[PDB]
Design a protein around this ligand. Structure first.
Ligand code: NI
Ligand code: NI
Length: 135
């Protein structure tokens, strides 16, 4: 089938994060008709990882970009982390729709450095993402 559309807002907000460090994170979702990827929520420049986690639905999928900052250790390194949040409680149709569209949204974001697929509270936890991003 045709590739899903990706709103220009997705790229616009991603570049604000990647370039301006204006937003700590961006959460994207498939619109109601599953015809376009759109921005749902953005975090402030200083939002925390726990702030981000509190935005994730327990029973639906999301895409997200998190500008992950590691602990200071000879300077402060960061990693642009792309996350597919696919909780097991999500309906199978949702899980399959977000799987099908993942490439499309990734292809539109210039500068992803790390990719995480998380399905439960442990795989989305900061410790798990940190280790995957350190890596
Ligand atoms: Ni196709
Ligand atoms: Ni903004």
């Amino acid at each position: 089938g045709p590739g899903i559309a990706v709103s220009d807002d997705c790229v616009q907000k991603f570049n604000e994060l990647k370039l301006g460090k204006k937003h700590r994170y961006v959460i994207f979702k498939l619109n109601d008709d599953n015809t376009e990827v759109v921005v749902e929520k953005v975090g402030g420049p200083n939002a925390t990882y726990e702030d981000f986690l509190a935005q994730l639905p327990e029973n639906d999928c999301r895409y997200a970009i998190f500008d992950y900052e590691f602990e200071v250790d000879g300077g402060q390194r960061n990693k642009i982390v792309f996350i597919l949040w696919a909780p097991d409680s999500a309906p199978i149709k949702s899980k399959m729709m977000y799987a099908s569209s993942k490439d499309a949204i990734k292809k539109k974001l210039d500068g992803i450095q790390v990719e995480v697929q998380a399905t439960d509270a442990d795989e989305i936890s900061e410790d798990a993402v940190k280790e995957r991003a350190k890596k």
